[PDB]
Amino acid sequence: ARILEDSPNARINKTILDRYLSLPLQENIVQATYVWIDGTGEDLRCKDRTLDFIPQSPKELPVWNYDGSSCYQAEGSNSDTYLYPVAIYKDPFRRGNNILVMCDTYKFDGTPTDTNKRKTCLEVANKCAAEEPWFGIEQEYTFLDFDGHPLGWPKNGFPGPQGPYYCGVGANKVYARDIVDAHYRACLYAGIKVSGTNAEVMPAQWEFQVGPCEGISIGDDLWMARFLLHRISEEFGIVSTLDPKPMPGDWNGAGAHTNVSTKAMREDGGIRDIEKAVAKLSKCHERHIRAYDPKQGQDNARRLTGKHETSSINDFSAGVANRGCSIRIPRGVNDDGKGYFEDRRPSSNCDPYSVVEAILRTICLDE
Amino acid sequence: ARILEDSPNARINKTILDRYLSLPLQENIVQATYVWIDGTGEDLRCKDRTLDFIPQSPKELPVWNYDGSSCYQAEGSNSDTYLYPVAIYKDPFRRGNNILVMCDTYKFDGTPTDTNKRKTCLEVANKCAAEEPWFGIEQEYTFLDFDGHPLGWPKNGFPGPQGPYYCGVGANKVYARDIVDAHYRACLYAGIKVSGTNAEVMPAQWEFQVGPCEGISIGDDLWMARFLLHRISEEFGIVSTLDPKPMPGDWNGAGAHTNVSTKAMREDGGIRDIEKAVAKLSKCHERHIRAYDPKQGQDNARRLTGKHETSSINDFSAGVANRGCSIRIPRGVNDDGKGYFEDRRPSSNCDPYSVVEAILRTICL
Amino acid sequence: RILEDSPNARINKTILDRYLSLPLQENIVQATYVWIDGTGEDLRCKDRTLDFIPQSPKELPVWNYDGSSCYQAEGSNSDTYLYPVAIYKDPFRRGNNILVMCDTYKFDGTPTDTNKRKTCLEVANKCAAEEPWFGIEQEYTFLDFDGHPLGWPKNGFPGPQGPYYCGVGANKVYARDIVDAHYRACLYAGIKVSGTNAEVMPAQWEFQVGPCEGISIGDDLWMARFLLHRISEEFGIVSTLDPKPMPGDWNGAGAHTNVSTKAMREDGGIRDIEKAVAKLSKCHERHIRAYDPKQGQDNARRLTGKHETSSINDFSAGVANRGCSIRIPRGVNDDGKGYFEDRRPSSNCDPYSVVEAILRTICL
Amino acid sequence: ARILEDSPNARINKTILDRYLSLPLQENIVQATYVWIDGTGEDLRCKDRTLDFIPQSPKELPVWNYDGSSCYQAEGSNSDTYLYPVAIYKDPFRRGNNILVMCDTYKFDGTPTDTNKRKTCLEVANKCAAEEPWFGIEQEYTFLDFDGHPLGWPKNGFPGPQGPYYCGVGANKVYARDIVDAHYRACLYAGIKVSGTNAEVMPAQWEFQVGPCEGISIGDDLWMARFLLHRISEEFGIVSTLDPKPMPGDWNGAGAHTNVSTKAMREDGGIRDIEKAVAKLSKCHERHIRAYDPKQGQDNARRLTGKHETSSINDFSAGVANRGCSIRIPRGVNDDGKGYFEDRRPSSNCDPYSVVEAILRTICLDE
Amino acid sequence: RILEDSPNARINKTILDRYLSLPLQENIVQATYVWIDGTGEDLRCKDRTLDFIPQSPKELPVWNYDGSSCYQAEGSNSDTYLYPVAIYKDPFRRGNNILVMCDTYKFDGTPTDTNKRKTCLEVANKCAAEEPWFGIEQEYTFLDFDGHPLGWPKNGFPGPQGPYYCGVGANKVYARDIVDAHYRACLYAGIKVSGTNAEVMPAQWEFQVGPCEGISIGDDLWMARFLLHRISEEFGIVSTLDPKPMPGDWNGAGAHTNVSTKAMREDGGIRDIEKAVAKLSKCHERHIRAYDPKQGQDNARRLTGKHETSSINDFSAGVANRGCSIRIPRGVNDDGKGYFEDRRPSSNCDPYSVVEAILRTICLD
Ligand SMILES: Nc1ncnc2c1ncn2[C@@H]1O[C@H](COP(=O)(O)OP(=O)(O)O)[C@@H](O)[C@H]1O
Ligand SMILES: Nc1ncnc2c1ncn2[C@@H]1O[C@H](COP(=O)(O)OP(=O)(O)O)[C@@H](O)[C@H]1O
Ligand SMILES: Nc1ncnc2c1ncn2[C@@H]1O[C@H](COP(=O)(O)OP(=O)(O)O)[C@@H](O)[C@H]1O
Ligand SMILES: Nc1ncnc2c1ncn2[C@@H]1O[C@H](COP(=O)(O)OP(=O)(O)O)[C@@H](O)[C@H]1O
Ligand SMILES: Nc1ncnc2c1ncn2[C@@H]1O[C@H](COP(=O)(O)OP(=O)(O)O)[C@@H](O)[C@H]1O
């Protein structure tokens, strides 16, 4: 009755679309959905165009543009903002040779927009290329009803206390698995390396893991995966939020925990290299928590500095297999004496480009 | 409209998923769902990962972990808990080469968790192998709406008294058969030997039978089957509960009656062996009740009173084709001089590993 | 309001199809055993996984159920046995899956009170040389979960009879989808459903089975009944065989029974038809006793002589006449051969008892 | 929201009437409501007329008529049926000098209707005038919603089992006390001797007791109490039923237990006269059952099974302090050597005139 | 949704008034007899017409009821007797109409199992010399018809505790109308209600009765409970006295009892009190049995030692302290004299048993 009752998309018919989706087209014709990051640094925008050819590379896609003043990227008279494809994926909605196109964005003068964090991240990731840095990201998120309350939670109230929902199974334990399952498979079909999923501590809260991807491709892939989550959830009338505190107080906020390695760390006795990198990471702490947050640490501080599977934003701790510590070497990695380390500081709404750039600067470029 | 009105999963669209399900993936890509028992010893948990190969046995799969502090399996600062794969099944939700994996769980130091009953059962099952013991379990369960009241029952009250609902047919006799049929088929596809189903005495109450299964297999199989029931139910917005007394008073609680035979018992003249086994089980009643419910024989006490065709919690009686009993020999087993016997004591929420072990201890060791 | 409280109507209906397309290894066979309970009117069922494709009812195992849970308590040994009698293709699962009609037997091998097949079969076998054929017109009514006829205004009545019989239209007949699904399921299963029609009462319908030789009418009508209840379950709709599912001047329900022997079907058999009707005239009370499963109590509520119906007490029979106990149809009196129509059996009759009683009187 | 949703009277505004009730008229305008029993023998009918005078006794009221063919009292084309006042009460709905009139009925030729039982009862009661016989009746009844299900019961189902509802207090114990309380007060005001009320075993079930009344007046007063019950219930959209089994099974039926005493049973040593009457009623069980029911034993046969605190229809019994019997003599009476006896046979829908006559015929006219 | 299924909430409430206002001759008197049933928790009532105005209880007729219809079955001798023991003016009917508190007796003239008044009264008269005064703080909770606390989100919880205690506002306290109506109806009836407040738990409230001399605190509290249920009823809201109307870290329910003798109150002061207290430290186990009507089984649920309550095993005494079993209020300590607080009695206690036990231990040894 109440659940999704005001959500426009949940109330529109979902069956008719298949009639039109079945329509055969000249294989020549290609619909391309260009996706980009808006002025908030948090949200995605998209639009599409018809091509008459199958592109092999993002360089073969035309440069496009949008009204930056309609996306919180105003620039007086000169608000036309340009779209530079950087990465191509198969489209799981249209399936043909139809494609999704991640972009980065440039002002009219050829300079990056404020929210373009990929330009510099790429400079750096090229300059550490020889080190073959690999990143995994654990993206947490919460499903909301249209009124902003977490999906399925009683209106004007709370479901039972945490305990039964983590990795839960059952109608009273986890909600909207359908979307999670759809999204997992859509990401796979699109060529994004999602390595798994789980249900989180808060009911309506989930996680998917992406990686491991090399260098800057973790940013393109996570951004596209976010796009896909929002877009799939839209069809259901459900809002997916990346906000780190989608509900105040005792309930679990949201991280984007980031797993890192270089070729040396992955090699035999890389443990010493890891332990070195964590030391370096462990103290420049005030500098990273700024580029782990699209508003420079104001979002972080709603979730962080507590005792709910997180990290204190105040100070810094580096433990082994410690969910309480900002940066963490897993037990099996100590045991193996090689592998990777987990940075538990990035917030669910982090920009991955900023995260990897801060990381690489510190552990490869030697600041 | 009240039925399922507040169930989130029942209020979310169900046809969109099929679009995404039919997406074709490159081969190499396998989705594996790991499943384990949590610190309650009753409830299941699960999560997924992507593999780049097709495993051939459980041994080929990666050991994995979870946070036990989030599963009622806290161990201070060392809360990481380990998932060991013990059985693979085909995945009926995702099909193809996708798989479901039953696990057992270990603490950070390599010891079993309190609710891992399989390590100790596996040991005993292995000592008893040559007697080739076979187990079947009749798992009773009940469908609930989101508010915890049994599915389709009138809000704040009761349907008609017992009688019409057992093995029923008709819109006013039995509810949500679609889940039952979907589950029977899913299990069969998964490789679980579901041997039957029926609607039970209580409206919204049902049973599926698993077996016969070789030794430790009954435990892996029944756990995975329970998983499948919860997980299929979930899509409908419906809760499946294995609680033994999901409504109080004169409403049939729930059992997990266990059928047992050894090789001796299945060969001509087995009835002698069956007779002896029943004899031994009669001198250690209390120990079995304690292993026959995962809270030491306390959820056993809200059901096993000595009424509604059942055992008594304090009292051990056996008999030939007798349902007011603990241990029963079926008429057809007696008439054939060979076969299997029925242990009626275990409750719907028993851990099958514990039931098996207790039994094999008494009648093989 | 319509079906708002029917649990099965409120549960999602599209998810099942995802699990139904699940491919299983050839040779796994699901078998659903079906039986009549201690009311003598209602059906029960459950299912088992089999190893093999049975070639005939004898190849299937004997099973059991707890009689105490279906009004068949025999104190301390209530374990009741299920003997397969007929096998049908399963229209719900298809493949090699089957439904299995049974009859039922106590612990000591004697028949339960509601097993009327045993005794009917002895009689029908004795009459086999007369090749008796039976056709049955099974009437029924769809109900909402509250017991009120489906679609009828709550706490009230739709317009008077006239427009609904064999109707077409959203305001003339209800739930044809179940009717059409049943019709085809029955044909797929191997049941000889010869026709259907909408009846005089809105939400009321009829299916005809036959002609079937002997005992097989009984098996087949029972499985068709099971199929009706079972298909209508998935819609959340109750199908009742109650003979007077609403009181007043609203059409009750019959299971009119058409009957012929070898002699009656050959030219000049009309003589033998009249012989048979005459033997049935002389023992009216024993048939009305056989013609509902409480011995003449349920038919009384229908048989008022007013609504296309015969008298409770008084036996009558005439050509072309729907006010009579036993009617000889126009076409058959004209043709000099065919069958007679027995209009006495109520919609909740056991066809084994009906067959047996008619065979005893016209063949014995 | 279902309780009373389909009941027309519950869905009509209730405060508007007050506006019109407070309209003053001159004391000499009298509204008289004539009430009678219809051809079912169970239900009441009524209608109103304006008088210009205040009658002093039933003798002073006009004899009236109605169309019996609309009340199941057809008699072909001579269907005009006559209404003779026999009792007047003060009207608790209009107050002032307005009145309710209980009547009995008579066919066009002056002979009584089949459902007029008063006539032959009053013949009898007059011959027993000396014995000064008193009657109390314990009228059980059930409130139903408009769909025929008991008021407040879950639709298509049953509330919790019996036990908590008898003389209960609490929103989840008893329902519609306002009607019970209104009616009790309205009976008193109208001039009926209502001695008490209680909530009964079945939820939605209630009882009021009337008496002790002298002779024939028990009949007139109880029929008028009945009228008032339905007429008051009607306002709330609630149906009040006197059906003896308003729900089949292990749910308590409804009786009209009748307390009886003569001058002689009330004096010292009266108990001796009592045990003699019981014995006389014990010799003719089948006579009474037929007088105890608007048919002749048909509705009793659904209530009276032996269980649920009532006598068997088949055989008779006495005892003391026993609620399983037909005729109960209270303890407090045996102990005091005087009082009355309780006939527990009459069903809730009995016609009281029929109950009284049959009892008097037996215990006074020595039949 | 709130009160949507409560029959009394859905019945028109304005019509009754046009009937109550009807006038009747002055010595027509409606009397409502009130008694405790076989649970020893719940009340029952029924009513009769008198033709006179009673001056005291003894002028009312002894009456009876069917004990087998209220869990007071004694086979075929089930008629149970009502003895009037206290009269109150009737706030629902006004005029000379009355409410009658009774105690109950078997057919043989002996007290029913749930009459604690008879023995309580014996002891009270023996301690009359020492002029004992009692004050009781009765907590209770309002429930919707489904048993969920009134106004709480269906299938869930409101915000944590903090804002509700002594709260003001539509989102802080619920159903103040019932509380005000009860407060006043009690005062009019002759019951010495001395205050009320909204409790920690949302929908939870309290009223205080007393100080009352001796046995009358039991009569008066019982009749106040009656009034609460009966007023609640007209709104279609349930009032429960269950000590833990919701599980976990939501505030249970007490019936804290304040106590004094003449000594303790007249100047002599806290040395009489400190001795009285030390007499209670001796017998905790015995008092927990007197302090709910199943003898420790319901208390165990709110007496956790957590959420401002004492633990059910261990005894404790502190000044101005709220974690203790017995309490000396700072205010009484500061002064020569006063009363002491007993914080162990549970919301569903029988006050007659609370008084008796306190009096045996303290005025009698
Ligand atoms: N050597 C590595 N370097 C970087 N990332 C890795 C490496 N190995 C694994 N990862 C990635 O880290 C992520 C692990 O997330 P998850 O399984 O949720 O870990 P946990 O929940 O134990 O913290 C996965 O995407 C995985 O692919
Ligand atoms: N020899 C045997 N040993 C163990 N289990 C058996 C044996 N034979 C059959 N079983 C299993 O016993 C179970 C019987 O379940 P069910 O038909 O519900 O029995 P009932 O309802 O009569 O107790 C099924 O799992 C069946 O496969
Ligand atoms: N000669 C016959 N002998 C036995 N049964 C017959 C014969 N002819 C027809 N039937 C059966 O009787 C049924 C006739 O029912 P129906 O056509 O509904 O009759 P009506 O038109 O009078 O309702 C058919 O379903 C058919 O199987
Ligand atoms: N002497 C008497 N003769 C006839 N009826 C009496 C006499 N004394 C009292 N009564 C009536 O008996 C009835 C008592 O009924 P009730 O109080 O319900 O008792 P119980 O609890 O035994 O059913 C009242 O109608 C009362 O007026
Ligand atoms: N001397 C006394 N002896 C017994 N009871 C008393 C005495 N003085 C006050 N009381 C009663 O104790 C109750 C106090 O309850 P309350 O005001 O809620 O106290 P608190 O909430 O501070 O514990 C009141 O009914 C009060 O009348």
Author numbering:
A (entry chain A), D (entry chain J): 3 to 369
B (entry chain E): 3 to 367
C (entry chain D): 4 to 367
E (entry chain I): 4 to 368
Q: What does the literature reporting this entry say, word for word?
A:
Glutamine synthetase (GS) plays a crucial role in nitrogen metabolism by catalyzing the ATP-dependent condensation of glutamate with ammonia to produce glutamine, ADP, and inorganic phosphate. Drosophila melanogaster GS (DmGS) has two forms, namely, isoform I (DmGS1) and isoform II (DmGS2). The cytoplasmic DmGS2 is the most abundant form in adult flies, comprising 90% of total GS activity. The three-dimensional structure of eukaryotic GS has revealed a decamer consisting of two stacked pentamers.
Herein, we report the X-ray crystallographic structure of DmGS2 in the ADP-bound state. Within the decameric structure of DmGS2, each monomer bound ADP with identical protein-ADP interactions. DmGS2 had six additional N-terminal residues (NSARIL) that formed a turn not being found in other GSs. The short helices, α-1 and α-2, the so-called meander region, located in the N-terminal region of DmGS2 was highly variable and also observed in other GSs, such as human and M. tuberculosis using ConSurf analysis. Moreover, the meander region of DmGS2 made contacts with neighboring subunits in the core of the pentamer. In addition, the pentameric structure of DmGS2 indicated that Asn11 and Arg13 from one subunit made H-bonds with nearest-neighbor subunits at Val176, Ala178, and Ile 5, respectively. Arg4 in each protomer of one pentamer forms H-bonds with Glu7 and Asp8 in each monomer of the other pentamer. Furthermore, Arg 13 from one subunit forms an H-bond with Ile 5 of the neighboring subunit in the other pentamer. Those interactions in the N-terminal meander region of DmGS2 may stabilize the five monomers and strengthen pentamer–pentamer interactions compared with other GSs. Thus, R4D was sedimented as a large, random oligomer. These data indicated that the N-terminal meander region that includes R4 is essential for pentamer formation and stability.
